[PDB]
Paper text:
Each subunit consists of a predominantly β-stranded extracellular domain and an α-helical transmembrane pore, which interact via an extended interface. Our study has identified a cluster of interacting residues located at the β1-β2 turn, the β6-β7 loop and the pre-M1 region of the extracellular domain, and the M2-M3 loop of the pore that exert a strong influence on channel function.
Both mutants crystallized in the same nonconducting conformation that has been observed in all known [name] structures. Small structural differences in the vicinity of the respective mutations indicate local rearrangements of protein interactions due to the loss of the bulky aromatic side chains. The data suggests that the mutations, despite their severe phenotype on channel activation, have only a local effect on the protein structure. Neither of the two mutants display ligand-induced channel activity in any of numerous independent recordings.
Numbering used by the authors:
A (entry chain D), B (entry chain C), C (entry chain B), D (entry chain A), E (entry chain E): 11 to 283, 285 to 317
């Protein structure tokens, strides 16, 4: 079995797409193994860059193809180099920018947390072993965090394991285990923008919707309630045109429904006050829910976190 | 005839575009046939990766070109390998990401169901036969489904058939039948998001439009109806800016039209009560349709499913 | 002159862009001509796929380059093959996906009709002739049409002509005519969606805008007219954010202006009745145009189709 | 010095991007120079297409690289050919589609005018001369213009000049002048759509804002003015979501501000009439600016063109 | 150590993406070093363009790979040339268009300032030195500035430094320092558009919201306040659909929140005047904050700049 040591440098993780569950990763990847010795031009180790690499492979040099399992399409590999040491060591260095996939749950959208994973396996060789993996996610941790969109929880955690592919050929008696490197980086979303510019104005509108009971006339309460209904629809539009569309209901999507229900229940209550015989307007209801309707919403919001 | 066995691994099916009738498919494709034996370097089977594959073809190696029929443009092939066995067997392994096309009907948009198909044929050889097809759609079935946007109904169905191309040359006496592998995967759309954040608020607004009859004055009924008219237009905007545009009317598109008619019919009814001579306001109409107008909408909605 | 027979198979025509006047075309293209006989490996005809074609050209094989005239950028060619017959025949088969250009007039947007054209010429040879062109647009005609966005009027029309390039060199005495194949496919847009989800609600809003005259007070008429003005502006937004933006006025764009004018003309009339001395409200005007204003709009709409 | 004659055929100029100052150009480019004679296979001139061109260069053929200066990234070259004449002439013909950059001023947006420029220089040779440039902009001038988005003013003007690159090496005594071909095509924007569907409804809304003074009550004037404020914001939204966003203020952007100012000045005037002691409502102001406020806007609009 | 002199020509810096912290850079890059002399064909220096460069490398020519550190994906290299002087000098000239990354803080959005940086290092050689760097950012400084979106503060500053990569192999005793060229260009955003078309109308809306206290009736004050609430939501939509979305709160985003608070505080004050026993309307409050509410906002705005 061949021993191959990898080193993955993460320069930047950006372009997080919660819908397609994808994220771009820019950086370098280095792999080193020890093979049969070689005569270098001059004793010092040789450097073979980019196009010259394939010429060495055509002459018989062994360079294994390592595939990112969870990658989304072939990544954009920049400069690539081979450092051939005379004692048999071979160091492959390559700059890459690629999009990777991992399951993402963002139902608690403003305060959700995800993990970015990378998975590396040899494409064709099972008789070759990844000896140790060292990541270098030296992006900042306490430089810009309150300003940045994501908060990395800490240095990445690595994991080398063996995967048993069952569905294979009929000629392998026992060789169906491959070496997989699985790196994981925990992260939490910065809720600053989504609190100040979305949850706060929603509360202001939802709270202002309860001030309909402080109007004197019954005719005044129903017509202004229709205007409040339009205002929630207007905010539901703004909150959906700017926020990323998603195939499931988020925390914010629920608050929008909550504002819809608050107003629709008000219209029923206003028409209700029917309730009394001979045209009495049940003024003890308008004044009671004048403060209870704000409280009933606050009581329902706490059971949302049950 | 040459016997070729295929195996298609589906990692992920994403990027479903109901408009262009396309969807992305990521995974691997393997093909195996037995040819003339060969002397390997060492007795064990050889592995030829990526750029080294074309060199063997230039020396005369036969590798048939397999084309995805329903593909949309040349797919993005990742790592490719040839495993040459000495006893004549040849295994072609390739990672691919490609966009495929199939007809999609989504008139019942929140509750529609589609199937994703793959169709594989040899590009130039009719005297060569695809012996058996095995798909490996080992994406989850009971892990994340309520959270996911699509619900796969179950393991994919395979189908090998023969296609008769009529319009061909004049030199083939009888050889105009090609072997087609047809994989089909059934799936149903997750209606959770589209119900809670779209159909539900639509019902609330449509219902609240009927509360115009609980107003006392005739002047009150017409002006608030214009506000209701504006409210439906505002919701038709939000529901069309976030939902995928389509060249036909969906279930939701029909509900939007229904809300328009409900309000316009109300404006006609409010003006109608006108009907009575000497300025009578036909108060038995306002109170009758106060509950009947909600019921007439429910009766028409049931005949929509006729 | 060399005789070259073409055959173009159209799988799918999608991605119609009325703005840039482009449309994607996926399918295969076949060309056959008879050249000097050849010794095949075995008597039967040879098949040369993909990378191996250029090797034969480097050894002197004549393969003419055929250019799509109206193409927009180099198309995406899939699998390509050469079928070399021993008696001299050569069959070139290639799968392609390309974007093509043709002038498009869509002023009658919901009910417009266009034609998709392809234009094929030899790139460098005028002393070579395209003998006959056969298209195979075997997309459905009676399968899905009401569900589909476009209605193909029928099988495509072919056309081989000669183009006289005047501005050329000074060494050709008379050879400046090239063979052009021009394929044309007629099509009509499916107006189902654009009628139900756009033209219909506009009429409802425009008609409901005429219900302002059934209000009793003069103060009531002006304020609801401003709400109607906002409603048309709101609909003008929705109709332009979802429909494709265009550099000219369509049928729908004219109706939008018509709703603007209807309301603006109403505001002038309401203020007019302012006209009468001593504060008379000209009640014979409000009631007359109560029905005439709908009719004047219908009368003006008929002269639009003049 | 080597004499090189160019000929540039412009099929279509589309995709004008006023923001990035870019525009797409599709067409052909031909270049001809006379070199050392050559032995052709057969006496007639040879045609070398696409991949075969590099083989002749590897054997020593001189083909100079001509670079588009104002290009934005490497263009998409279609088919390329070399016509080698035996008397030394060489004709290079290539189809290309590329994006070019040029400064664009569009402050008078609906009625602005621009020019599309091309600049061609040899990439490495200063001891080689571009003898004459002939453009073939045979796009229509009198076919479709009112229907088309841009109006080409007339046939393109050519211009060959010399550029003095100062910052160079230290080994060139005086050879720092290169030959530049500069083609310029004038064009004016079709204001039909932007007049009918934007400037016209803006005037309708702005004018209708002045009808607030024809209301009788002071309470009526302020509340409807707030509705007018919402209508302008709604139109400012519609006019900015469909029109191309720009980093400077256009003619339409100024009218939007003008509508904002008209309404805000009205709100100040309505509150003003606060001005009079003992609660007098200054009815001579409401009626004066009832027509003067429309006139003051018309007077301010004329000084905008000062 | 090899001495390498660079020269970087910047034609244009466009496509600034404050979200992804990226910006496109088009221009040329030149590098010159002196190596072992060579026999040129003729005494004068040779010019090797594009495809012919790799042929010289296959014959043993040393061309070091220089990588842009902060680049985002492989850049688009246009024409590339090698000027081989007989005395050993080698001049590499290449046209490039690439997107570069640098941290961007835009919290003071209309009046923020950024710097565009480029970072160049040899990819594999540490025993090679960049001797001096000369940038040529000869974009205008006094031509178009008020018209342009960004204001370049002045000529770029160069900086050659040494980077100590710690995490390296175990065979380098001390050679882990590479030569880095760091170019920096300061720039300030043109606030003309964002002031006239956004901050100005926002103040107009925010100020007009304070005119609610000049209404006479209490019922009038609350309902028009809801219309103002809808107007701010409408403007928050318009300002967020056109301005670039960002993961943090800007200057404009704070003003939007300020308008939200101004109105919600008004709704509380109107209901407050509850405050007085027996139904007194506290008219000394409505008139006091009639001017104080405008002043309290201005006082809060100054402490925003604290």
């Amino acid at each position: 079995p061949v021993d191959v040591s990898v080193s993955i440098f993460i320069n930047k993780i950006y372009g997080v797409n919660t819908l397609e569950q994808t994220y771009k990763v820019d950086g370098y990847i280095v792999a080193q193994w020890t093979g049969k010795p070689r005569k270098t031009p001059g004793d010092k180790p040789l450097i073979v860059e980019n196009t010259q690499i394939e010429r060495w492979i055509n002459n018989g040099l062994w360079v294994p193809a390592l595939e990112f399992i969870n990658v989304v399409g072939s990544p954009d590999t920049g400069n690539k180099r081979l450092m051939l040491f005379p004692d048999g060591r071979v160091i492959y260095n390559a700059r890459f920018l690629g999009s990777f996939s991992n399951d993402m749950d963002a139902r608690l959208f403003p305060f959700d947390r995800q993990q970015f994973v990378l998975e590396l396996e040899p494409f064709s060789y099972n008789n070759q072993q990844l000896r140790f993996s060292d990541i270098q996610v030296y992006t900042e941790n306490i430089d810009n965090e309150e300003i940045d969109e994501w908060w990395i929880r800490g240095k990445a955690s690595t994991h080398i394991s063996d995967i048993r592919y069952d569905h294979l050929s009929s000629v392998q008696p026992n060789q169906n285990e491959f070496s997989r490197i699985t790196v994981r980086i925990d992260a939490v979303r910065n809720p600053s923008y989504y609190l100040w510019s979305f949850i706060l104005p929603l509360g202001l509108i939802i709270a202002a919707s309860w001030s309909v009971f402080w109007l004197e006339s019954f005719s005044e309460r129903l017509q202004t309630s229709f205007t409040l209904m339009l205002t929630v629809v207007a905010y539901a539009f703004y909150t959906s045109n700017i926020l990323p569309r998603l195939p499931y209901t988020t925390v914010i999507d629920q608050m929008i429904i909550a504002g819809y229900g608050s107003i629709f229940a008000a219209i029923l209550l206003i028409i209700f006050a029917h309730r009394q015989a001979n045209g009495v307007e049940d003024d003890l209801l308008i004044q009671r829910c004048r403060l209870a309707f704000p409280l009933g919403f606050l009581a329902i919001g706490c059971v949302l976190v049950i």
